[model samples]
Target: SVNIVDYSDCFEGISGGAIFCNTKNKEYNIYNKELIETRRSPCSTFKIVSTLIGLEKGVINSKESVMGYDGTDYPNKNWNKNLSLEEAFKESCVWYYKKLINKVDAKSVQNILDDLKYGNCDISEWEGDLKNGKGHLNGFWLESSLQISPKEQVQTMAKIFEGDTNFKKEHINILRDIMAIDVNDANINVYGKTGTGFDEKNKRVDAWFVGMLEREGDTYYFAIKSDDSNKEITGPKVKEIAINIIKKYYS
Candidate 1:
């Protein structure tokens, strides 16, 4: 039997959930059942989708492709400079993707999202929300129109890990490499993407960490989300919680 550990203390007042799928045992462990079923905007986690669509459509020649920053005053100083695709992904550079999406026609992007059955799959033009300012046609994932549940997030990661999606093997390999964060002494390879955004309706920051871990030929896909108005949740903070849970449960 798979033990669904209660790590709710890590989340405290946040309305959050974590879901894990063990490929070897073919079992599932979930925390916060009701929360996992609720959908929210994907925020930067949508970068995974944007990267895939960008690569598939030739918007990005390869993972090494370089895009120079246009010198816009962004909140993060790290983003106000030239960046390769890999660096962009790591930094979660919103401007870089905005530029890339400009090159991709709406129909192509819509088709890609439809094929993937991503989130609520709503890409229609939406006005900006309070937390995220000034929405554009290509920026719907940023607290705009797109919404996905924690359960869907983990399931999507599982699809990628199992190679059940329509993306090419090479593209998947590149993504797998790009998402990697670190390898522990135990040789557990951790790969994930984090997202953070404010929930205007709920008045909280929605944080996310979604990805997979590989060790000893076994793979586990997981997704975590935290929503709390009392604190400003960040991507790194969410990732830290996930890493701790992973080490405790899977190490």
Candidate 2:
């Protein structure tokens, strides 16, 4: 058994959960147990799975593969130009993945999800009160049908580190490289993905940060999810919460 700590103040006014798992000991520490078990949209964090599928299907030839942006103005200036696979992943370019989805069949995509055992594993359509009009064919994870729990997020990261999936080494390495974040000169490597979306039914914004940390030959996987009915909770804020939690142990 492991002791679960309460760090709810890290995300005050948000209904969510944060969980950490020490891979070596198979121990878990969590806050907001109920929230961790509740399934919600995976949001942009689904990019990790999509990227792997793109690589496996050859839709994305390599990290160097490039795609030109459409002339439309996007919210993020960083997504307005032609982007290599690496760049698109870093920027969370939704259009790039949408195009890739056009190249791959739905059955193939479903197979990947089934293999991963992701939350509810339902990619058919967005079942939320809000509709993107784009339907579930593309960008289904963006406040649409797909949902995953914080506990599952950490488990998925652990699977990535353990090579529990059919993905090749090259593919995993590319993903790891893209997800790497600077640790401020700390003697540790942090890899993670952030997701933000609006939950129409719940009348809230959802934020997520999920990843793995490696230090002194020990690896820890963690996931943080936060939600606010009025405030727009963002990916960076979720990430900051996780970083502060990590510091409690590493520092």
Candidate 3:
């Protein structure tokens, strides 16, 4: 059995936070025990999967693919205009992905989910929490239905990085372009996606950061998440939590 070091100190102001890390020389599984087994919505993190599908299916290209914004006005000013593939993925353009999924169809999407073993792989409510007015009509991959755990995030991430799945190398090449996160360390190459979920009152509800790091001979796959009720618990904020934890090792 692998020993997991505790790193709960990264969780401040966030309640019931969890972390799972698999590095070259060490491993860390921190915070609440129940948190380890908890599966939460992927929120924007699903863009990692969506973008892969888009690129592989020829729905979106590597550099030139762009999604024109509908006439829909959004609270976030950034989502108002046309978006390149990288821009749409980075800016959390829900409508762009929503349209991509509808075009790809459910059966094909379901097959990919099952192949990847992503969470429950249930697209039962693919239309998402629309009619009920819980949130926006963002499909199941949003904060609506699809659930993935922290540990599972690391596992699925490995499959993607190791080329153990069916994705094209060309597609994966472009995916790494936007998912890459600058960790401020010249030796480390980090790639991750941050996701946020909001409550009906517009308060932050769930936050996630899931990806892997490559440096020299070492590779660490990790996922950080918090269903913390704090209003400041956003996906980008949780990413800071992950980075600090990463520093404990490299620093």
Candidate 4:
């Protein structure tokens, strides 16, 4: 068995929270007591929700469905002429997802958000102008000045696992399966999505990953957030930490 170290060592320069769960026991814990309710932009990690919305609206089917990619030469850009939703998700194709947002109607988008119980809903023209063509905002896109807490984050993920949201079982299964890249490793089965928010001023960036896992009949979910002044945090960083932690505890 791997021995997990105390996590306090990693928080020196970071302002974030992490959740841990024992699927077999149905237990969980959150670091940083006050950080739970302080909502930061979920970044691309929120893409999972968007994906679910797309599937529910019938805009896209399985991850293998095709999406046209633009050749803008943006960082991490892939002009996937025809990409399956699975490939697009693993590749985290912003162009493909943005195309999805543009193609869908505003009212449909609003309904998706409403169904998800997103707070502070505002698809206003002003907000649209500010976040046009982007993936997410700082306490904006999800319709709130404040963001979902670690507790709620896990709750949403639980919904995904239970197939309780608008998403059908097949789509949720596809998402859970694709996210298994990091989740179902010999180390862990940590299904999740990652997000990186924009940093217009001072170039600071916020990163996020939220998902859950089930072993046997029990389930557990977790969220990871990282905001760096240097705009340097990446999803792999959180994934690496999570992997190491799980290895420490369960391996």
Clashes of each: 0, 0, 0, 14
Better of 1 and 4 by TM-score: 1
What C-alpha lDDT, on a 0 to 100 scale, does residue 189 get in candidate 2?
88
For candidate 2, lDDT tens digit of each residue in 176-199? 888898968478888899988878
Please give the lDDT score at residue 5 for candidate 2.
80
lDDT of 3 by residue, 67-163 (tens): 6666788887877777788877778778788877777878989999999999999899888867557555567977677888877778788888878
- List candidate 1 segments past 4 Å from native: 1-4, 12-14, 126-138
Give the whole-model CA lDDT for all candidates, comma-separated: 0.81, 0.80, 0.78, 0.61
Give per-residue lDDT, candidate 2, residue 227: 75
* lDDT of model 2, residue 193: 91
**Candidate 1 lDDT, 89-134, residue by residue in tens:** 9998878988887778878878877777677888784333534435
lDDT of 1 at 207: 92
Q: What TM-score would each prediction reach against the true structure?
A: 0.90, 0.91, 0.89, 0.78
All models, RMSD in angstroms = 2.4, 2.4, 2.8, 4.7
Preferred candidate (TM-score higher): 2 or 3: 2
TM-score of 3: 0.89
What value does the lDDT take at residue 228 in candidate 4? 61
Give the candidate order by descending lDDT. 1, 2, 3, 4
- 3 against 4, candidate with superior lDDT: 3
